[PDB]
Amino acid sequence: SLEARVRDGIGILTTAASSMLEKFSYIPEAKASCYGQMERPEVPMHTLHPFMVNVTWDGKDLSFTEEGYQVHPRLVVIVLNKDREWEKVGKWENHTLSLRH
Amino acid sequence: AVLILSEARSLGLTGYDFFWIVPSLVSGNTELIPKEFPSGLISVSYDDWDY
Amino acid sequence: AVWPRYKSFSDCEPDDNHLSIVTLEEAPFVIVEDIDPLTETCVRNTVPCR
Amino acid sequence: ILGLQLINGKNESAHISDAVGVVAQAVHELLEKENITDPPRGCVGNTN
Amino acid sequence: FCIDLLIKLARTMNFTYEVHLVADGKFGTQERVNNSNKKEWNGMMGEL
Amino acid sequence: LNIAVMLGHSHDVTERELRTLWGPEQAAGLPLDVNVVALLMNRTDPKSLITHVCDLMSGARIHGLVFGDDTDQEAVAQMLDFISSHTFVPILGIHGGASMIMADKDPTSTFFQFGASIQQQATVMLKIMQDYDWHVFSLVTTIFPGYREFISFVKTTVDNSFVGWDMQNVITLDTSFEDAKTQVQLKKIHSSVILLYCSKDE
Amino acid sequence: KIVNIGAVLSTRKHEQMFREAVNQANKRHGSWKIQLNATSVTHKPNAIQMALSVCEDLISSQVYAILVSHPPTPNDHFTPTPVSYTAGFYRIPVLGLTTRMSIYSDKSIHLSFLRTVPPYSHQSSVWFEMMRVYSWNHIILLVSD
């Protein structure tokens, strides 16, 4: 559910921030402005980035691959019915399907 | 006939191998060929070339 | 004796699944027979050759 | 050293003229069609 | 037999040979590599 | 930090009650307590997205944004990548058009999505085919970008197992779906399972 | 009845040339129906201001296609990416003129971007074509990545 999604996002962002703070106490705040007369680069490379992947949240893990995907998603397989609504049939798991019907 | 053949042209079934066949009254005037007939129609008719 | 494959209208896909084939009679390999009286088409396990 | 070079290159005038010609040809071809709808009125206002 | 055939072929053609026996021993087959999800050619066909 | 959360007009239409993710103490054990600022957006467009994100940046300096919308437009992901690349703001979407994956991202980008690649979806599809004994089928893919990777992956997976699949034919169906060309090669699908791949309207 | 063809050119002289060219093109097939007006925007630095400017100054006039070109003064640091993204949001086709980088050559990202110059690989094509004419077979390939 959406609340779980936003909670997980806040968690991963905070964990990345804590990891970067533990590495060093630099913690850059932000840039001067999104637009305007600014043209020179600001971030050293991208401030924080390599600590945003291979992170966990005390239980379920989620690490973003180099191309932007996940590595352990939560795909499910769904099907319409006579009431015109995707209900559910089975799900995915570690590497197993385990269909219901 | 011309309407149906034109409508079937705007569909798959007027290719190289889709041989059509029509009676005499579909081709009853000889020298009044419409545009929409294919170039492979086969039609039987009372002869008017000889006789 | 064979349908000359007339052009469809003016511009259709040129045929690429029709191709002529030659053959010469020999004793156990290719045998040429006549046409069956009943069911005046060729027999079931046979092909029509001009 | 055996190099290479495009003959026209930075000749933006000829490219501009030819692009305008091609777009004019395309719009003349297209505007005689069964269904035609105008482009969006602005960036802000719709997401279609 | 094959050595004589190769000698005749090399004499008729124009090349030189450096015959080396196979390392594995198997004639050659397609097989799925262990601890993976792909497959490859093993045996003498592998060196091809 | 000043993480900003931005959704709009979804099943979670509470809005006022949406201020509950990290709003209360929850699990306040990690150091560097953060401040969460919410917003509600109905419509999405390039200029509007640019203005909203830039205005948020100019005000409460965000160290990362969490997006998520309701519309089905596929290019909002590209617009978000473009925003993140030239602003150094770690944006990442969750639900909606800002999540569907279609193409890779520039190495300098910092935009991540809660999604799954085409390859994982293809693997699950083949697995669900194999369980119910439907190993005979045919592909029907349009000219939508990324179709070549899908075709190649399915072909390799079929040619790398032991079950005994039988790919009847691969159709690259293209051009307007009214003409004779669409109908001639859509009539040859004599199998019983079809594996369409296209956008929603197509 | 009336249509517009905007462009993102380099300098004012190119704008005058574009206006003269479109006026001349209006002379060939002008049997009523089409009027084919024109608009004008010059390159700008940065990227965000560029996207805002293209949105307002072009899509406020119901363009049918945009025409982009390489920046005159700077190097490739100002590639026409923002215009391509903004135009491809609505699937309005955009035409490039002198941008050869082989990154726009694929349709996966830039769905609607067709140019009028061969990007770089046709150099390899002509290399191979001349290779047989000069009769060399064994070659090596050294290239960046």
XYZ file of C-alpha atoms in Angstrom:
645
model
C 0.000 0.000 0.000
C 1.006 3.588 -0.702
C 1.804 4.358 2.935
C 4.213 1.419 2.973
C 5.809 2.716 -0.234
C 6.411 6.227 1.087
C 7.650 4.833 4.406
C 10.125 2.576 2.595
C 11.320 5.484 0.462
C 11.871 7.691 3.496
C 13.685 4.788 5.125
C 16.077 4.160 2.252
C 16.839 7.873 1.890
C 17.506 8.248 5.623
C 19.678 5.123 5.656
C 21.741 6.485 2.768
C 22.119 9.809 4.585
C 23.211 8.050 7.780
C 25.732 5.928 5.875
C 27.216 8.986 4.169
C 27.399 10.772 7.534
C 29.148 7.780 9.109
C 31.659 7.786 6.251
C 32.380 11.479 6.865
C 30.626 14.526 8.309
C 30.616 16.514 5.052
C 26.864 16.214 4.248
C 26.498 18.909 1.556
C 23.196 20.739 1.894
C 22.108 21.770 -1.618
C 23.092 23.871 -4.634
C 22.773 27.618 -5.163
C 19.721 27.472 -7.446
C 18.118 25.203 -10.022
C 18.178 27.917 -12.692
C 19.514 31.414 -13.322
C 23.010 32.420 -14.423
C 24.670 29.411 -12.768
C 26.679 27.256 -15.175
C 29.616 25.793 -13.228
C 29.228 22.321 -11.685
C 28.571 22.179 -7.947
C 28.650 18.548 -6.751
C 32.148 17.008 -6.404
C 30.946 14.048 -8.425
C 27.352 13.658 -7.215
C 27.720 14.265 -3.449
C 25.869 11.126 -2.321
C 25.242 8.238 -4.717
C 27.241 5.007 -4.141
C 25.649 4.657 -0.687
C 22.128 4.749 -2.170
C 22.366 1.128 -3.382
C 22.834 -2.276 -1.685
C 20.890 -1.030 1.331
C 18.454 -2.818 3.636
C 15.633 -1.707 5.929
C 15.787 -4.250 8.770
C 14.219 -7.205 7.005
C 13.214 -6.959 3.358
C 16.200 -5.822 1.301
C 16.215 -3.710 -1.847
C 19.294 -2.870 -3.913
C 19.064 -0.842 -7.109
C 21.013 -2.237 -10.041
C 23.346 -0.078 -12.108
C 20.708 0.327 -14.830
C 18.031 1.575 -12.408
C 15.977 -1.566 -11.711
C 15.791 -3.568 -8.506
C 17.312 -7.007 -8.001
C 14.554 -8.613 -5.868
C 11.248 -7.123 -7.061
C 7.737 -8.007 -5.863
C 6.036 -8.939 -9.122
C 2.569 -10.479 -9.005
C 0.458 -12.045 -11.750
C -3.153 -10.878 -12.037
C -6.146 -11.613 -14.251
C -9.514 -10.037 -15.009
C -12.792 -11.729 -14.100
C -16.507 -11.430 -14.806
C -16.659 -8.343 -12.554
C -14.010 -6.471 -14.609
C -11.298 -6.022 -11.998
C -7.807 -7.489 -11.654
C -8.135 -9.605 -8.544
C -5.072 -11.871 -8.081
C -3.704 -15.290 -9.009
C -0.582 -16.357 -7.171
C 2.449 -14.122 -6.771
C 6.226 -14.269 -7.041
C 8.727 -15.164 -4.331
C 12.469 -15.670 -3.833
C 12.554 -17.595 -7.103
C 9.300 -19.605 -6.930
C 5.876 -18.931 -8.431
C 3.373 -20.732 -6.150
C 0.190 -20.123 -8.111
C -3.173 -20.369 -6.369
C -5.383 -21.738 -9.156
C -19.861 -7.234 -57.804
C -17.696 -4.160 -58.333
C -18.512 -2.876 -54.840
C -17.671 -6.207 -53.180
C -14.448 -6.616 -55.157
C -13.357 -3.078 -54.255
C -14.139 -3.720 -50.594
C -12.209 -6.997 -50.642
C -9.206 -5.280 -52.232
C -8.898 -3.213 -49.046
C -8.283 -6.517 -47.265
C -5.970 -9.481 -47.541
C -7.883 -11.564 -50.056
C -6.843 -10.042 -53.393
C -3.270 -11.339 -53.590
C -1.313 -13.392 -56.091
C -3.128 -16.619 -55.156
C -6.768 -15.745 -54.470
C -8.375 -16.844 -57.754
C -11.902 -15.436 -58.121
C -14.658 -16.810 -60.371
C -17.848 -15.100 -61.564
C -20.806 -15.995 -63.802
C -21.683 -14.357 -67.108
C -23.938 -11.630 -65.713
C -21.028 -10.276 -63.651
C -19.114 -9.722 -66.913
C -22.066 -9.191 -69.226
C -20.871 -6.230 -71.305
C -17.273 -7.260 -72.170
C -16.100 -3.787 -73.211
C -17.283 -2.043 -70.030
C -14.462 -3.097 -67.703
C -14.630 -1.263 -64.357
C -11.551 -0.247 -62.423
C -12.020 -2.517 -59.406
C -11.905 -5.912 -61.121
C -8.662 -7.846 -60.566
C -6.472 -8.945 -63.457
C -7.225 -12.630 -62.940
C -10.999 -13.007 -63.084
C -12.352 -16.178 -64.680
C -15.824 -15.948 -66.193
C -17.841 -18.198 -68.486
C -19.994 -16.636 -71.174
C -21.865 -17.352 -74.380
C -19.386 -16.756 -77.170
C -19.596 -13.636 -79.313
C -16.130 -13.643 -80.911
C -16.868 -16.463 -83.347
C -20.397 -17.640 -84.257
C -2.191 -26.487 -68.831
C -0.855 -24.404 -65.905
C -2.224 -21.138 -64.542
C 0.228 -18.384 -65.571
C 0.085 -16.508 -62.215
C -1.431 -13.213 -63.316
C -0.547 -9.963 -61.557
C -3.053 -9.091 -58.849
C -3.917 -5.422 -59.486
C -0.821 -3.345 -60.338
C 1.355 -3.398 -57.213
C 1.100 -6.281 -54.744
C 3.740 -8.259 -52.893
C 5.806 -10.192 -55.469
C 5.576 -13.933 -54.965
C 8.513 -15.527 -53.152
C 6.999 -18.933 -52.309
C 6.515 -20.168 -55.889
C 9.462 -21.597 -57.794
C 9.725 -23.936 -60.771
C 11.460 -27.311 -60.528
C 12.884 -29.692 -63.137
C 12.943 -33.502 -63.028
C 13.864 -36.486 -65.210
C 12.300 -39.944 -65.079
C 14.190 -42.864 -63.530
C 13.224 -46.366 -62.489
C 12.932 -46.438 -58.662
C 13.182 -42.714 -57.880
C 10.652 -40.795 -60.016
C 7.889 -42.766 -61.752
C 5.415 -41.066 -64.102
C 1.958 -42.616 -64.493
C -1.297 -41.715 -66.221
C -4.437 -40.193 -64.670
C -6.836 -42.282 -62.594
C -10.195 -42.846 -64.370
C -12.303 -42.422 -61.244
C -11.753 -39.139 -59.393
C -10.156 -37.684 -62.503
C -7.650 -35.727 -60.420
C -4.330 -37.349 -59.561
C -4.043 -40.095 -56.937
C -3.571 -39.181 -53.263
C 0.168 -39.899 -52.929
C 1.165 -38.290 -56.221
C 2.018 -34.854 -57.587
C 0.987 -33.315 -60.938
C 3.847 -32.798 -63.388
C 3.567 -31.320 -66.861
C 47.168 10.693 -42.428
C 44.054 9.519 -44.292
C 41.120 11.454 -42.852
C 37.557 12.229 -43.866
C 35.151 15.152 -44.074
C 31.511 15.713 -44.974
C 31.290 18.008 -47.989
C 28.432 20.198 -46.730
C 29.094 20.218 -42.987
C 28.342 23.543 -41.303
C 26.254 25.043 -44.116
C 23.117 25.667 -42.061
C 21.482 27.743 -44.821
C 21.148 24.863 -47.292
C 20.059 22.464 -44.553
C 17.432 24.934 -43.312
C 16.044 25.444 -46.808
C 15.874 21.716 -47.542
C 14.313 20.887 -44.172
C 11.629 23.523 -44.740
C 10.981 22.059 -48.179
C 10.624 18.526 -46.812
C 8.279 19.645 -44.036
C 6.159 21.574 -46.547
C 5.918 18.484 -48.748
C 4.944 16.336 -45.764
C 2.270 18.735 -44.518
C 0.810 18.992 -48.020
C 0.668 15.196 -48.229
C -0.813 14.766 -44.750
C -3.413 17.539 -44.587
C -5.623 15.682 -47.091
C -6.542 12.922 -44.647
C -9.715 11.645 -43.011
C -8.826 12.533 -39.405
C -6.754 15.535 -38.300
C -6.453 17.249 -34.910
C -4.583 20.408 -33.967
C -1.502 20.234 -31.711
C -1.712 21.050 -27.989
C -2.314 24.688 -27.108
C 0.466 24.804 -24.504
C 2.741 22.815 -22.237
C 0.621 23.570 -19.151
C -3.014 22.521 -19.344
C -3.060 18.921 -20.543
C -1.171 15.625 -20.346
C -2.319 13.946 -23.563
C 44.508 -42.158 -42.339
C 43.757 -38.537 -41.459
C 47.467 -37.689 -41.378
C 47.924 -38.969 -44.930
C 44.814 -37.097 -46.073
C 46.111 -33.903 -44.470
C 49.498 -34.368 -46.148
C 47.836 -34.747 -49.546
C 45.605 -31.729 -48.912
C 48.551 -29.563 -47.854
C 50.581 -30.616 -50.891
C 47.692 -29.876 -53.265
C 46.914 -26.592 -51.490
C 49.514 -24.159 -50.088
C 49.714 -24.037 -46.289
C 51.674 -25.395 -43.329
C 50.367 -27.466 -40.425
C 51.201 -27.477 -36.706
C 49.059 -30.432 -35.576
C 48.276 -30.445 -31.854
C 46.156 -33.084 -30.152
C 43.039 -32.153 -28.203
C 43.251 -31.308 -24.508
C 39.936 -32.622 -23.174
C 39.265 -35.846 -25.075
C 35.527 -35.735 -25.716
C 34.449 -35.465 -29.343
C 32.299 -32.408 -28.652
C 28.790 -31.669 -27.399
C 26.552 -28.828 -26.289
C 26.039 -28.789 -22.534
C 24.799 -26.382 -19.887
C 27.656 -24.941 -17.846
C 27.568 -25.841 -14.162
C 26.318 -23.260 -11.645
C 24.880 -21.040 -14.384
C 21.942 -20.779 -16.801
C 23.779 -20.865 -20.156
C 25.296 -23.579 -22.336
C 28.409 -23.997 -24.449
C 30.421 -26.360 -26.638
C 32.798 -28.758 -24.898
C 35.269 -31.306 -26.170
C 37.287 -31.087 -29.360
C 34.612 -28.884 -30.936
C 35.376 -26.308 -28.242
C 38.776 -25.474 -29.719
C 37.024 -24.739 -33.023
C 17.232 16.760 6.068
C 14.198 18.192 4.247
C 12.869 15.266 2.209
C 9.817 16.270 0.175
C 6.930 13.895 -0.542
C 4.685 14.591 -3.532
C 1.708 12.470 -4.619
C -1.777 13.336 -5.797
C -5.382 12.171 -6.173
C -4.834 8.434 -5.799
C -6.495 5.695 -3.763
C -4.767 7.284 -0.742
C -6.760 10.507 -1.018
C -6.546 11.172 2.723
C -4.132 14.106 2.226
C -4.628 15.387 5.774
C -4.120 11.874 7.149
C -1.304 11.387 4.626
C 0.834 13.404 7.064
C 1.536 10.245 9.073
C 4.605 8.761 7.336
C 7.447 9.754 9.706
C 5.204 12.577 10.936
C 4.935 10.985 14.375
C 7.926 9.446 16.147
C 7.456 6.052 14.420
C 10.953 4.474 14.665
C 13.057 7.499 15.638
C 16.247 5.597 16.367
C 18.447 6.624 13.464
C 20.351 9.909 13.910
C 19.912 13.064 11.795
C 16.188 13.580 12.255
C 14.540 14.754 9.042
C 11.696 17.133 8.234
C 9.015 15.950 5.803
C 7.114 18.463 3.665
C 4.121 17.277 1.648
C 2.303 18.629 -1.395
C -0.690 17.806 -3.586
C -0.511 17.957 -7.390
C -3.354 17.135 -9.785
C -1.990 17.789 -13.287
C 1.442 16.973 -14.702
C 3.304 18.648 -17.560
C 6.929 19.525 -18.389
C 6.699 23.217 -17.482
C 4.616 22.545 -14.365
C 7.012 19.851 -13.134
C 9.986 22.133 -13.788
C 8.402 25.043 -11.923
C 7.212 22.994 -8.942
C 10.521 21.204 -8.401
C 12.548 24.390 -8.874
C 10.305 26.321 -6.471
C 10.701 23.579 -3.871
C 14.472 23.694 -4.391
C 14.624 27.483 -4.000
C 12.695 27.266 -0.728
C 13.227 24.447 1.754
C 16.441 22.905 0.414
C 15.640 19.248 -0.295
C 18.232 16.484 -0.125
C 15.943 14.126 -2.066
C 12.408 13.977 -3.465
C 9.929 11.088 -3.559
C 7.590 11.375 -6.538
C 4.544 9.400 -7.673
C 1.546 10.384 -9.782
C -1.709 9.021 -11.194
C -1.422 9.480 -14.968
C -0.247 6.894 -17.503
C 2.125 9.052 -19.579
C 5.369 7.182 -20.183
C 7.621 10.233 -20.614
C 7.275 11.628 -17.085
C 10.116 9.276 -16.162
C 12.316 10.875 -18.819
C 11.384 14.337 -17.574
C 12.291 13.347 -14.007
C 15.639 11.973 -15.177
C 16.283 15.250 -16.990
C 15.369 17.164 -13.817
C 17.676 15.125 -11.602
C 20.626 15.196 -14.003
C 20.898 19.001 -14.127
C 19.979 19.671 -10.479
C 21.771 16.991 -8.379
C 18.586 16.253 -6.424
C 18.183 12.540 -5.573
C 14.664 12.009 -6.902
C 13.019 8.583 -7.007
C 9.442 7.708 -7.893
C 7.250 4.959 -6.503
C 3.810 4.593 -8.101
C 2.338 5.738 -11.392
C 3.914 6.972 -14.601
C 7.115 7.819 -12.736
C 7.741 4.092 -12.210
C 7.330 2.224 -15.510
C 10.741 1.341 -16.929
C 11.371 1.710 -20.656
C 15.036 2.643 -21.079
C 18.287 3.027 -19.175
C 19.544 6.258 -17.600
C 22.640 8.402 -17.940
C 25.477 7.464 -15.552
C 25.394 10.891 -13.884
C 21.675 10.499 -13.132
C 20.343 9.789 -9.636
C 16.778 8.740 -10.456
C 15.752 5.255 -9.314
C 12.425 3.488 -9.776
C 10.499 0.846 -7.828
C 10.153 -1.363 -10.866
C 11.261 -4.537 -12.627
C 13.151 -5.015 -15.868
C 11.699 -6.553 -19.016
C 13.835 -9.659 -18.502
C 12.287 -10.487 -15.121
C 8.788 -10.084 -16.558
C 9.690 -12.361 -19.466
C 11.051 -14.982 -17.070
C 7.852 -14.935 -15.012
C 5.799 -15.178 -18.213
C 7.685 -18.237 -19.411
C 7.386 -19.823 -15.965
C 3.614 -19.333 -15.874
C 3.353 -20.738 -19.397
C 5.325 -23.823 -18.381
C 3.241 -24.669 -15.304
C -0.101 -25.003 -17.112
C 1.264 -26.925 -20.138
C 0.794 -24.312 -22.869
C 4.178 -24.693 -24.578
C 3.018 -23.612 -28.022
C 2.481 -19.958 -28.897
C 3.465 -17.023 -31.112
C 4.705 -13.472 -30.545
C 2.934 -10.313 -31.696
C 5.044 -7.203 -31.065
C 4.664 -3.693 -32.464
C 7.307 -1.052 -33.194
C 7.274 0.294 -29.644
C 10.850 0.932 -28.438
C 12.537 -1.959 -26.677
C 10.794 -4.700 -28.655
C 14.035 -6.081 -30.110
C 15.398 -6.897 -26.653
C 12.154 -8.693 -25.787
C 12.199 -10.743 -28.995
C 15.849 -11.690 -28.533
C 15.371 -12.653 -24.884
C 12.347 -14.847 -25.591
C 14.149 -16.512 -28.499
C 17.231 -17.252 -26.389
C 15.207 -18.600 -23.460
C 13.238 -20.912 -25.755
C 16.482 -22.150 -27.341
C 18.129 -22.794 -23.952
C 15.798 -25.145 -22.032
C 14.683 -28.782 -22.114
C 10.874 -28.599 -21.944
C 10.253 -28.607 -25.687
C 8.741 -25.256 -26.657
C 7.462 -24.686 -30.207
C 7.528 -21.055 -31.356
C 4.968 -21.010 -34.163
C 5.955 -17.635 -35.631
C 7.194 -14.157 -34.739
C 5.116 -11.233 -36.011
C 6.584 -7.719 -36.242
C 3.144 -6.203 -36.910
C 3.548 -2.597 -38.007
C 1.863 0.298 -39.866
C -1.744 1.424 -39.436
C -3.952 -1.395 -38.173
C -6.580 -0.925 -40.886
C -4.744 -1.809 -44.082
C -4.373 -5.172 -45.791
C -0.806 -5.632 -44.538
C -1.949 -5.878 -40.919
C -4.715 -8.355 -41.763
C -2.733 -10.706 -44.014
C -0.122 -11.554 -41.365
C -2.523 -11.424 -38.419
C -4.491 -14.323 -39.940
C -1.618 -16.810 -39.574
C -1.768 -17.017 -35.766
C -3.220 -20.535 -35.561
C -1.826 -21.309 -32.092
C -3.686 -20.960 -28.790
C -1.339 -18.734 -26.730
C -0.313 -15.217 -27.761
C 2.336 -13.000 -26.186
C 1.436 -9.446 -27.253
C 3.832 -6.598 -26.435
C 2.758 -2.997 -27.029
C 1.741 0.237 -25.366
C -1.763 0.638 -23.954
C -3.469 2.327 -26.916
C -1.871 0.066 -29.523
C -5.905 26.690 -42.719
C -2.893 28.204 -40.942
C 0.033 26.204 -39.539
C 3.330 27.107 -37.894
C 6.833 25.631 -38.107
C 9.042 26.841 -35.283
C 12.801 26.612 -35.095
C 15.645 26.971 -32.605
C 18.470 28.582 -34.576
C 21.833 30.175 -33.765
C 21.748 33.898 -34.613
C 19.449 36.533 -36.091
C 20.904 36.135 -39.591
C 19.836 32.488 -39.553
C 16.386 33.631 -38.415
C 16.162 35.967 -41.410
C 17.320 33.158 -43.699
C 14.681 30.820 -42.253
C 11.950 33.432 -42.703
C 12.967 34.067 -46.314
C 13.091 30.321 -46.989
C 9.623 29.723 -45.551
C 8.226 32.687 -47.493
C 9.722 31.255 -50.689
C 8.319 27.801 -49.906
C 4.901 29.431 -49.517
C 5.185 30.431 -53.194
C 5.318 26.959 -54.764
C 2.146 25.282 -53.442
C -0.012 28.097 -52.104
C -3.355 27.198 -53.692
C -5.242 28.458 -50.627
C -5.745 25.819 -47.899
C -2.275 26.057 -46.344
C -0.768 29.335 -45.113
C 2.301 28.007 -43.258
C 3.396 30.851 -40.982
C 6.639 30.774 -38.972
C 8.064 31.575 -35.530
C 11.528 32.186 -34.064
C 13.621 31.413 -30.963
C 17.386 31.684 -30.420
C 19.624 29.374 -28.383
C 20.023 30.071 -24.672
C 22.579 28.950 -22.074
C 21.737 26.574 -19.200
C 19.085 23.881 -19.615
C 16.088 24.628 -17.373
C 15.534 28.116 -18.769
C 15.871 26.570 -22.232
C 13.049 24.098 -21.565
C 10.817 26.815 -20.134
C 11.538 29.044 -23.133
C 10.805 26.338 -25.699
C 7.533 25.426 -23.971
C 6.202 28.959 -23.809
C 7.597 30.578 -26.957
C 6.783 27.633 -29.256
C 3.974 25.487 -27.862
C 1.968 28.625 -27.160
C 1.558 28.849 -30.955
C 0.491 25.268 -31.868
C 3.603 24.190 -33.744
C 3.577 21.204 -36.091
C 7.332 20.478 -35.965
C 10.420 22.031 -34.402
C 13.777 22.548 -36.120
C 16.925 22.483 -33.985
C 20.582 23.097 -34.775
C 23.972 23.015 -33.094
C 24.930 26.014 -30.925
C 27.234 28.461 -32.733
C 29.648 29.600 -30.022
C 30.138 26.836 -27.415
C 31.219 23.215 -27.730
C 28.936 20.168 -27.345
C 28.194 21.235 -23.732
C 24.832 22.586 -24.959
C 23.520 19.627 -26.946
C 19.839 19.913 -28.031
C 18.612 17.394 -25.472
C 16.018 19.536 -23.614
C 14.225 20.471 -26.833
C 14.117 16.817 -27.878
C 12.671 15.704 -24.533
C 10.070 18.471 -24.386
C 8.945 17.864 -27.972
C 8.923 14.084 -27.548
C 6.694 14.425 -24.507
C 3.830 15.262 -26.890
C 5.265 13.215 -29.803
C 5.680 16.373 -31.899
C 8.417 15.477 -34.421
C 11.628 17.501 -34.276
C 14.284 17.799 -36.988
C 17.988 18.094 -36.277
C 20.418 19.805 -38.621
C 24.104 19.431 -37.648
C 24.124 17.290 -34.491
C 26.215 14.135 -34.943
C 26.803 12.261 -31.692
C 25.289 8.775 -32.286
C 23.405 9.079 -28.987
C 20.241 10.294 -30.732
C 20.696 7.561 -33.347
C 18.670 5.096 -31.255
C 14.907 5.393 -30.889
C 14.683 3.856 -27.406
C 15.132 7.176 -25.591
C 14.496 9.917 -28.171
C 11.414 8.450 -29.809
C 10.768 11.329 -32.239
C 14.043 12.837 -33.474
C 15.036 12.509 -37.140
C 18.029 14.440 -38.458
C 19.424 15.203 -41.920
C 23.099 14.182 -41.580
C 24.790 10.800 -41.157
C 25.974 10.678 -37.542
C 29.284 8.793 -37.527
C 28.893 5.166 -38.590
C 28.696 5.971 -42.298
C 32.385 6.802 -41.912
C 32.911 3.138 -41.041
C 30.704 2.179 -43.987
C 32.831 4.167 -46.438
C 35.963 2.790 -44.757
C 34.796 -0.733 -45.565
C 33.729 0.277 -49.079
C 37.159 1.735 -49.876
C 38.925 -1.155 -48.112
C 38.113 -3.613 -50.899
C 39.029 -1.048 -53.563
C 42.469 -0.664 -51.987
C 42.584 -4.439 -51.339
C 43.430 -4.936 -47.680
C 42.068 -7.890 -45.708
C 43.765 -8.290 -42.317
C 42.853 -5.300 -40.134
C 42.712 -4.292 -36.479
C 40.112 -2.145 -34.725
C 41.334 0.438 -32.208
C 38.602 2.707 -30.847
C 37.493 4.548 -27.722
C 34.393 3.543 -25.760
